[PDB]
RNA sequence: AUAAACAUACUUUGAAUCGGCCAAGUCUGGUAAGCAGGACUGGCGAUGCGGGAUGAACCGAACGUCGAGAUAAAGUGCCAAAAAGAAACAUAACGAGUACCACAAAAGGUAUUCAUUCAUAUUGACAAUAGGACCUAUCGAAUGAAUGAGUCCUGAAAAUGGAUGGCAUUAUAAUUUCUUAACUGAUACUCGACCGUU
RNA sequence: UGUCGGCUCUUCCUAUCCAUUUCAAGCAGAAUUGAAAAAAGGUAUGAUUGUUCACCAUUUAAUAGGGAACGUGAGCUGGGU
RNA sequence: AAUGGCUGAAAGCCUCUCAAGCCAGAAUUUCGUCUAGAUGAAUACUUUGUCUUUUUCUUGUUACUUUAGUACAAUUGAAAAUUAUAUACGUUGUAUUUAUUAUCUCGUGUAUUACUCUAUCAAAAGGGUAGUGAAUACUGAGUUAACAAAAUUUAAAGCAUAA
């Protein structure tokens, strides 16, 4: 038969299947559209949430009816300490998407990028980064650099730089730095390179890839509450009082 | 029934010169060039002399060929043939549509670029609304008078669609068509020679 | 003995279910097949009645789970491997054993760019159909039901014809030049006794 | 498809025994023509074949079967209507070639199979009197149209290969 | 050093739709491509040389053979039939085989 | 504009059948697939016959001054006028059914030859370019 | 006329069974039913095998164990053993495709092919342009009306996602007819071997 | 094969009630009426009766019609039977 | 999409097209964005530089160990486009597996290469330069074969050290 009374479905199809991620940090899945008539800059960052406060905010609209006064408006403070660059990475649109043509590296990698390679560090030997360090200057070793470069100039559609935090600067408790690859936008690919590699050892800061009054996406992985009902996870109605084996369930 | 050999032919001034490279015929003029591509796979277009008039000598001509085939695909021999017809009437004597505006008792106000390649429509019917229809390639919108614009141009597939464009952008919805009579109108369509 | 070359198939103007079925036939007699570029396959009809024959084919998907259902794979490359695979023996040892000796895709990768391209008398375009039949481009269609990848394939295509075109002139000029020196030899007077074996058999 | 010049006689007491019903009938075998001729005078003339003889039976070659000439063939045919007449031309050089045409294009544009058309007469007609518009255009001195889209011919099935090598491309032939 | 046979593919045994006789062998031989080329090779042996990886502790050989003759053609296409001392493994189904040139008759 | 026409007296090359490669001339057009070939039996061999278009070969040459229905005695005259086996024989289908016709008497001792000689010159060709 | 000696005529004793069902160039009650009830015959029951993709009844054909060959129904683009050529009416569409069988109607169409009847057709028939329904000039070959027969389109709407069997085809690998002393194929037919009954 | 209804929940059909895009009117405007594309979204609160159904009082843009073993009993309730 | 249209035949006129070619138009479809996601890619460090099987150490993986056996650089594989295809020719008439004159030895230089190797410049190239070797054409001469043999493509045992 049809049901009697229509109603709007409970909890969207859009996220099903519902598995929890891994990693704490959320991959950005997606980078703004490029444009190739500007010139280059970052598209992204990576902060620490930290809390959230209320302010009187003044209003500055036009033909709006809420009081002169002030607007009572949450916010939030998300720390950003500078980021440090350590490397870049340039992909190539192939028929089965992008992929990684080659990744070069700078020199001097800090201690809390080489962590991201190891799961044990206490009893690791430390040795990420020290033949690729060693051998930077040779020049065997720097035409491959060299090369890379030319590679990436010719054969290469989009740049992305290997930016990681630094976790001195953060009061938390963890000391391995979280990367992230943060695309550049602008003009030619001659140019994103001669841009991306200008920028290798050097910290970027918020104000270099944000504006005032600027909308962003934020991206990150929601609140952690293991397993849950019907009634908390989707919504669906608490059956009456007298159900036999209990009421907090579809029926 | 299926027609042997359906024959076209279209004659060529003496101002005008055609050049055809598989179906892709160009033809150059004292008012420009113009290009058309006749997708048809079962027509051969070849310039040739034939004697139009009974008593008459030879004179260059572009004949459309079509032969054994269906009355379905041997119609598109005279499409063909009248399509070039226009490309050699195009580009020696221009094609003109004057078009006129008819308002009951809102004045239409027309804004024209600069450059002629795009119009603009005001007030009409009051509606705060200002839609622009813009132009297509090679098509130049002037303004004759008070009330009447005439769009010049070489292609008439260009002209006119132009011309229906400005027409299809200027209609009365959830109102009685029979007495809301506005809009933009085709007055006439001729040349500009 | 032991078939292990490769049969390359370029898929420029061919038939869809009429290249398929010389394959599916083939693959089964110990061949090995890639088809390059099945993209450029042909299909019958047009474009406007070539989506319902894939919104009909979108339907049909397991109603409980759709991760389970028919996965309806796009990519022209995809959309001949299914073709093919529906005239293989289905679910046995010798239906996927000849499958593994089959492959497309859409551009030309650079191993099977540089090999002797084969045709099927009996698949092309041109000799089964009428000419004002509407055909429609396998990559023309998988763009309509959302194939991404198709601007990816005509620049790489128009990077291998400005490749092999400059390839074809140098190639050309050293075969006109040696055919025209087979010429001089063959009216040399030092090799008057050879041509006449030659030339009785009519090799010159 | 033949041609064969049939005879038989009455011998009863309500035909005389001197009057010979000849024919000329079209069919496969000389077995499915005297079927053709026994029921033709069972349905005319109220002869069985139990009470009859078959005097003379042979088949009607071709005089010149190297000389085109326009056939013209009348013919009855029973449609799910009524019962019709048609008149149908045909070229071909033999009087059992043009019957065999009219089988095919009668089986094919109207859908009525062999068991339903009666072929009353075949005879030759004038260049000028053939009506089809189709098979008017085909009959004057200066026909001349270019074979196009062939397809090459191979000399037999000897060469006939399931996969060829190269582009393949059709003929101006 | 020289090639004195010509490679037939073993398509299958003799069967029906649902239905499968192992005593006959239909084989493609290649280059022959109607029914009226195939009386020349009524008869010429065809032998399924195959390879067995053995340890080196057997006496048996790492290379044998189950040889056969062709014996009548089938189908227009220029199939053959063969029959062997012993019904070819349908392992073989899409291999190679050998059609020699002997019991010659030119 | 299409070169080569099928019309009456247009030299038609039969491709299969008991007379395949040999020349045929056009008599009468039956309809848009049917021709009446007369090549003439007593030069060529192909007797007068209805063939299909699906059969022939149409060649550049046209018999001079054939009209339709020819007689086997008159037609004879005309094919022999213009000299069409002269003719015939010099394009690159003619040299292509000679060709034909001596490779098939090659034995094997021929067959070795021509390989062996075919290589020595091609190679000495190739090093003759720089 | 034809068949009939393991022919013909029986005698005694006795077992099982009397819930039946299906097909139709048949019938009755019923609006109708995979409904109820019958006459003649064949089957399923009691029955496998080759074919209809699957199916108790449909088509071929009834079975000791086999080997080789021609066959029957029916098919020969691939799954699938096996076919090439010829002609047409269709196919700008989930239209066409193995009967029983798993559906489609009345009606409408200036959609298309063929045929029939009638009329106007020349130095002048229609459309068109120019001038004064009708006439003239130019334009120069077919034109107009009615009827019949195929094919096609609308008519055509149901609940899990799916069924010419699937893939797929579109001057076919579809529908209708044909040509070639072509091909494929059952446990049935022929020959040979072996077991048993008479 | 646990045999009515209701509560809870999901999905499917279109012979569409609202929203979107269009034609027709005896469409001047407003209101309305007939039909076409289209099933991605939405389609209520209560008094009496065990009721499906019904009839009333309101509200909304609309308060459309149906199927899933007359959906759903080791899901419930036991009002009726 | 329904619908409104443009040029336009059929059918000299008319027509949005049960014709070729196009435009405008939905809460529609597809990219874009959101969530889950398989085969993958790059980089860092440890190795390995033809090869696997069996026992065996570890929580487990790789490297590693022992006794074996196996080949040792050098002729393969690309025009594109159209099919009513500029004109000419129809260049006919067997796709991969399957296009080398048995082996070895002695001989002069030249020339060639989608050949091998090294160095360099470059390179997600059947790339350029230089050198060397191989094969081949000019193009040789000579020895040997009779009986048997011309099958590798993988087996069996360990845990010292390092990551």
Same mark, same amino acid.
């Given at each position: ?21 891994h ?8 980078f ?79 201690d ?43 054969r ?27 695309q550049? *936008?602008?003009?030619? %690919? ?28 934020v ?13 908390k ?17 579809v029926? | ?104 008792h ?5 804004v ?10 005001q ?17 130049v ?7 009447? %614009? ?44 | ?15 869809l ?7 599916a ?29 894939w ?15 028919? &996965?309806?794979?796009?990519?022209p ?42 045709? %099927?008398?009996?698949?092309?375009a041109?000799?089964? &159909? ?73 090799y010159? | ?71 013209? %063939? ?18 071909d ?6 019957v ?37 255009? &085909? ?35 | ?16 739709q ?45 290379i044998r ?42 | ?9 247009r ?97 094997? &001792? ?7 000689? *075919? ?12």
């Amino acid at each position: 038969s049809h049901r009697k009374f229509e109603a709007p479905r409970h909890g969207s199809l859009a996220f099903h299947p519902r598995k929890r991620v891994h990693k704490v940090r959320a991959t950005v899945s997606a980078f703004p559209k490029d444009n190739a008539a500007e010139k280059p800059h970052l598209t992204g960052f990576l902060g620490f949430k930290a809390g959230m406060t209320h302010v009187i905010r003044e209003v500055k609209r036009t033909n709006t009816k809420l009081p002169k006064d002030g607007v009572l408006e949450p916010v939030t403070i998300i720390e950003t300490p500078p980021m440090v660059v350590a490397g870049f990475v340039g992909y190539k649109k192939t028929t089965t998407g992008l992929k990684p043509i080659t990744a070069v590296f700078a020199e001097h990698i800090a201690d809390e990028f080489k962590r991201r390679y190891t799961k044990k560090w206490y009893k690791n030997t430390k040795n990420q980064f020290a033949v690729h360090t060693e051998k930077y200057n040779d020049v065997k070793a720097k035409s491959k650099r060299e090369r890379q470069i030319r590679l990436i100039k010719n054969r290469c559609d989009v740049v992305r730089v290997i930016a990681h935090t630094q976790m001195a600067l953060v009061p938390l408790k963890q000391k391995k730095a979280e990367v992230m690859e943060i695309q550049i *936008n602008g003009g030619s %690919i001659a140019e994103k390179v001669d841009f991306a590699v200008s920028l290798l050892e050097k910290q970027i800061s918020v104000n270099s890839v944000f504006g005032t009054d600027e909308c962003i996406d934020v991206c990150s992985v929601t609140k952690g509450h293991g397993y849950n009902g019907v009634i908390k996870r989707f919504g669906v109605r608490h059956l009456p009082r007298k159900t036999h084996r209990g009421l907090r369930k579809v029926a | 029934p299926r027609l042997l050999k359906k024959t076209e032919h279209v004659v060529i001034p003496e101002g005008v010169n055609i050049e055809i490279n598989r179906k892709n015929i160009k033809v150059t003029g004292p008012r420009g060039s113009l290009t058309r591509e006749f997708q048809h796979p079962k027509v051969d277009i070849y310039a040739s002399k034939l004697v139009v008039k009974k008593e008459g000598p030879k004179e260059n001509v572009v004949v459309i060929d079509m032969w054994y085939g269906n009355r379905r695909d041997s119609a598109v021999v005279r499409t063909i043939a009248s399509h070039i017809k226009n490309m050699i009437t195009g580009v020696t004597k221009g094609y003109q549509y004057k078009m006129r505006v008819v308002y009951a008792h809102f004045p239409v106000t027309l804004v024209i670029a600069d450059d002629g390649k795009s119009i603009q429509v005001q007030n009409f019917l009051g509606e705060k609304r200002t839609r622009h229809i813009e132009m297509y390639d090679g098509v130049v919108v002037k303004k004759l008078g008070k009330d009447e %614009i005439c769009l010049e141009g070489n292609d008439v597939e260009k002209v006119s669609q132009s011309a229906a464009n400005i027409h299809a952008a200027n209609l009365v919805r959830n109102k009685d068509i029979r007495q809301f009579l506005d809009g933009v109108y085709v007055s006439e369509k001729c040349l500009i020679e | 003995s032991t078939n292990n070359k490769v049969t390359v198939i370029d898929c420029h103007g061919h038939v869809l279910g009429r290249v398929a079925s010389v394959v599916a036939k083939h693959l089964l007699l110990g061949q090995k097949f890639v088809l390059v570029r099945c993209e450029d396959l042909q299909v019958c009809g047009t474009l406007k009645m070539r989506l319902v024959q894939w919104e009909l084919y979108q339907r049909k998907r397991v109603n409980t789970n759709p991760t389970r259902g028919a &996965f309806h794979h796009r990519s022209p490359a995809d959309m001949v491997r299914k073709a093919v695979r529906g005239m293989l023996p289905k679910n046995n040892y010798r239906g996927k054993l000849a499958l593994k000796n089959l492959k497309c895709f859409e551009g030309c990768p650079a191993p099977y760019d540089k090999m002797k391209k084969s045709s %099927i008398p009996e698949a092309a375009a041109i000799y089964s &159909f009428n000419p004002t039949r509407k055909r429609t481009l396998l990559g023309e269609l998988g763009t309509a039901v959302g194939w991404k990848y198709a601007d990816v394939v005509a620049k790489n295509e128009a990077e291998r014809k400005e490749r092999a075109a400059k390839w074809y002139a140098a190639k050309q000029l050293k075969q006109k030049a040696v055919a025209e020196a087979k010429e001089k030899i063959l009216a040399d007077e030092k090799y008057k006794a050879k041509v006449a074996i030659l030339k009785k058999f009519g090799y010159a | 498809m033949k041609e064969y010049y049939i005879t038989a006689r009455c011998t009863d007491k309500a035909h005389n025994p001197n009057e010979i019903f000849r024919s000329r009938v079209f069919a496969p075998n000389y077995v499915v023509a005297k079927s053709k001729f026994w029921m033709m005078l069972k349905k005319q003339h109220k002869v069985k074949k139990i009470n009859a003889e078959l005097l003379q039976c042979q088949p009607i070659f071709e005089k010149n079967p190297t000389v085109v000439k326009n056939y013209q %063939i009348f013919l009855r045919y029973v449609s799910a209507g009524g019962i019709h007449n048609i008149t149908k031309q045909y070229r071909d050089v033999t009087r059992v070639g043009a019957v065999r045409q009219m089988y095919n294009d009668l089986a094919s544009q109207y859908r009525t199979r062999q068991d339903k058309i009666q072929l009353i007469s075949i005879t030759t007609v004038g260049d000028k009197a053939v009506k089809n518009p189709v098979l008017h255009q &085909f009959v004057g001195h200066h026909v001349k149209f270019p074979m196009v889209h062939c397809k090459p011919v191979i000399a037999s099935k000897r060469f006939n290969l399931p996969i060829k090598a190269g582009k393949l491309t059709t003929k101006l032939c | 050093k020289c090639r004195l046979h010509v490679n037939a593919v073993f398509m299958g045994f003799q069967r029906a739709q649902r239905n499968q006789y192992p005593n006959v062998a239909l084989l493609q031989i290649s280059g022959v491509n109607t029914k009226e080329d195939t009386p020349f090779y009524i008869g010429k042996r065809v032998a399924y040389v195959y390879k067995v990886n053995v340890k080196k502790g057997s006496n048996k050989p790492a290379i044998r053979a189950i040889f056969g003759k062709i014996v009548a053609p089938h189908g227009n296409h220029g199939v053959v039939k063969a029959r062997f001392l012993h019904n070819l493994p349908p392992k073989a189904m899409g291999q190679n085989l050998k059609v020699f040139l002997y019991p010659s008759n030119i | 504009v299409f070169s080569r026409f099928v019309e009456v007296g247009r030299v038609v090359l039969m491709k299969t059948g008991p007379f395949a490669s040999k020349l045929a001339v056009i008599v009468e057009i039956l309809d848009h697939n049917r021709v009446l070939v007369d090549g003439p039996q007593a030069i060529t061999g192909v007797p007068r016959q209805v063939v299909n278009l699906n059969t022939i070969s149409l060649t550049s040459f046209v018999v001079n001054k054939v009209t339709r229905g020819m007689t086997h005695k008159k037609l004879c005259l005309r094919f022999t006028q213009d000299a069409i086996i002269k003719r015939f024989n010099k394009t690159a289908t003619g040299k292509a059914i000679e060709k034909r016709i001596l490779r098939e008497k090659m034995t094997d &001792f021929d067959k070795f030859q021509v390989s062996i000689i *075919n290589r020595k010159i091609n190679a000495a060709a190739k090093i003759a370019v720089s």
